C-alpha cells in the first residue's frame, strides 16, 4: 500500500531518531555509576544499534535503571521498525498475487 | 507470488554475498587495531553469520569504525533477508486461502 510504504519509511526515520535519543540518554543516565562503560555518545551509538537489531554481542550494556529503561524503549522500537518493514513487504507481495489472478 | 519466490531467492543470494563481503571487509578494517580478533577470513565468516542471524554469542566483535559500519550493513541485510522470506511464506498462504473460498 501507499500507506505501508509511508509507514515503513516513517519507522526507519523514527528508529534513527530513537538510536540518537538512545545514545544521548544512555550517556546522560549512566555517567555517575562507577564501572559504567556506556558514557560516550559514539559508543552509546554502537551500543544503541546492536541493542535495536538485538545482536547483543555483549561488549556493552547499561548498569542503571534509566540505562535499562532506555534500552527497553530502543529494543521495542527496533523490533517494531523491522517488523513493519516485513509486514510492508508482505502487503506488496499479497497485492501483486491478488491482481495476478484477480 | 512468482515475484515473492524470485525476491526470496535473490535475498538468499545477496545475504551470502554480504556475508562474504562481510568477512573480507571486516578483516581488511580490523587489521591494524591491536587486540582485534576479527583478522582472519574464516573467523570473519563465522562472525559474519552470527551477526546476520543476530545470534551474537559474543565470541567475536569489531573494535573499529569500519568494523562496526560493516557489522551494521551485515545485521541490516540479515534481518531484511529473513523478513522477506517470512513475507514470501505469508503471501503463499494468503494466496492459498484466497482461492480456498474464492
Amino acid at each position: 500500500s501507499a500507506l505501508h510504504w509511508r509507514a515503513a519509511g516513517a519507522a526507519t526515520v523514527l528508529l534513527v531518531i530513537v538510536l540518537l535519543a538512545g545514545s544521548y540518554l544512555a550517556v546522560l543516565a549512566e555517567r555517575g555509576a562507577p564501572g559504567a562503560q556506556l558514557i560516550t555518545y559514539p559508543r552509546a551509538l554502537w551500543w544503541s544499534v546492536e541493542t535495536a537489531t538485538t545482536v547483543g554481542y555483549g561488549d556493552l550494556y547499561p548498569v542503571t535503571l534509566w540505562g535499562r529503561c532506555v534500552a527497553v524503549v530502543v529494543m521495542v522500537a527496533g523490533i517494531t521498525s523491522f517488523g513493519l518493514v516485513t509486514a510492508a513487504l508482505a502487503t506488496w507481495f499479497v497485492g501483486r498475487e491478488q491482481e495476478r489472478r484477480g | 507470488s512468482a515475484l515473492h519466490w524470485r525476491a526470496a531467492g535473490a535475498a538468499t543470494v545477496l545475504l551470502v554475498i554480504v556475508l562474504l563481503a562481510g568477512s573480507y571487509l571486516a578483516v581488511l578494517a580490523e587489521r591494524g587495531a591491536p587486540g582485534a580478533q576479527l583478522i582472519t577470513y574464516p573467523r570473519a565468516l563465522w562472525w559474519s553469520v552470527e551477526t546476520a542471524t543476530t545470534v551474537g554469542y559474543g565470541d567475536l566483535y569489531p573494535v573499529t569504525l569500519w568494523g562496526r559500519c560493516v557489522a551494521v550493513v551485515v545485521m541490516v541485510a540479515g534481518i531484511t533477508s529473513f523478513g522477506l522470506v517470512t513475507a514470501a511464506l505469508a503471501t503463499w498462504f494468503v494466496g492459498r486461502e484466497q482461492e480456498r473460498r474464492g
Partner: antibody, heavy 119, light 108 residues
Framework: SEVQLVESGGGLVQPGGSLRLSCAAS????????IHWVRQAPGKGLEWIGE????????NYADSVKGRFTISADTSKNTAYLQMNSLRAEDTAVYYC???????????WGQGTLVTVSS | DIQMTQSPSSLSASVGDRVTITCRAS??????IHWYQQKPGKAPKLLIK???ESISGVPSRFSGSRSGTDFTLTISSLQPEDFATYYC?????????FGQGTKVEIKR
C-alpha cells in the same frame, strides 16, 4: 585559543567555608557538551572532580568531593559554577574547568584559579 | 576505579633524543586513553586522543601508540619546549581518571 573558557571566583576561604567558582563559555558550544572541574593540589597530579550537561542540568561528582560540593549552570549566561562547602585543607589547589563533547577528552580548558583554605 | 600508572615518573633525556612514556591501565580500557601536556603554571593541553589520533596543531614529534593494558606517548627528537609534565587519561569506565604524571627535564 577560541571558545576560551574564562574562569571567575577563587581566593582564601575559611576551613569549612563556601566559595562559588565560575566558568564562562565565550565561544561556540554544542548543547550536549559537559563542563568538568579538575583539581591540582600544589606539586601533585590532576584529579577529576565533577561534570554537568548545562542543558539537562544534571551533575555527577567524585567520592572525594561527595555532597560537600555542588555543580550548577546558568544556561542564560553560558556560565557553569562550582559551589564548595565543608572545605578542608585537602581542597587547597588550583581548579581548572574544561569542556568535553561527550567523547571522553578535554579540548579546551580554563586559565585555572587557586582556592586556598586556611584559618 | 581504573588505575592509570605512568612510567617513568620523571625523565632527563638529551635534546634530539627519542623519549617514551608508558601508562599501564589496571584493566583493558580499549583505546579510550588521551595524553595531555602541562607546562608549569598552565592548563593541560591535549596531545593525543584515542591512543593514536593526533590533535590539530600538535607537532609531529609527539605520537601515541600501543595496545594491551600498555599505552605509550613518544616524542621523536626531544625539544627544549617539551619541558612539561605529561598526563594520560581514560574515558573507558565512569568516572574519568588521570595518571600520576611523567615530568620531562631536558639535559644539555
Amino acid at each position: 585559543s577560541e571558545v576560551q573558557l574564562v574562569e571567575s571566583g577563587g581566593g582564601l576561604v575559611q576551613p569549612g567555608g563556601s566559595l562559588r567558582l565560575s566558568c564562562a563559555a565565550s565561544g561556540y558550544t554544542f548543547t550536549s557538551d559537559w563542563i568538568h572541574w579538575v583539581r591540582q593540589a600544589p606539586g601533585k597530579g590532576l584529579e577529576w572532580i565533577g561534570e554537568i550537561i548545562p542543558s539537562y542540568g544534571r551533575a555527577n561528582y567524585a567520592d572525594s568531593v561527595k555532597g560537600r560540593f555542588t555543580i550548577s549552570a546558568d544556561t542564560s549566561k553560558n556560565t557553569a559554577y562550582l559551589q564548595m562547602n565543608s572545605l578542608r585543607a585537602e581542597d587547597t589547589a588550583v581548579y581548572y574547568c574544561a569542556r568535553e563533547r561527550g567523547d571522553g577528552y578535554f579540548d579546551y580548558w580554563g586559565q585555572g584559579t587557586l582556592v586556598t583554605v586556611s584559618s | 576505579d581504573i588505575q592509570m600508572t605512568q612510567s617513568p615518573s620523571s625523565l632527563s633525556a638529551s635534546v634530539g633524543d627519542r623519549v617514551t612514556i608508558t601508562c599501564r591501565a589496571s584493566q583493558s580500557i580499549g583505546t579510550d586513553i588521551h595524553w595531555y601536556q602541562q607546562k608549569p603554571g598552565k592548563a593541560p593541553k591535549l596531545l593525543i586522543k584515542y591512543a593514536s589520533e593526533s590533535i590539530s596543531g600538535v607537532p609531529s614529534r609527539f605520537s601515541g601508540s600501543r595496545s594491551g593494558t600498555d599505552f605509550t606517548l613518544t616524542i621523536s627528537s626531544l625539544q627544549p619546549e617539551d619541558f612539561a609534565t605529561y598526563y594520560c587519561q581514560q574515558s573507558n569506565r565512569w568516572p574519568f581518571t588521570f595518571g600520576q604524571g611523567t615530568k620531562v627535564e631536558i639535559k644539555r
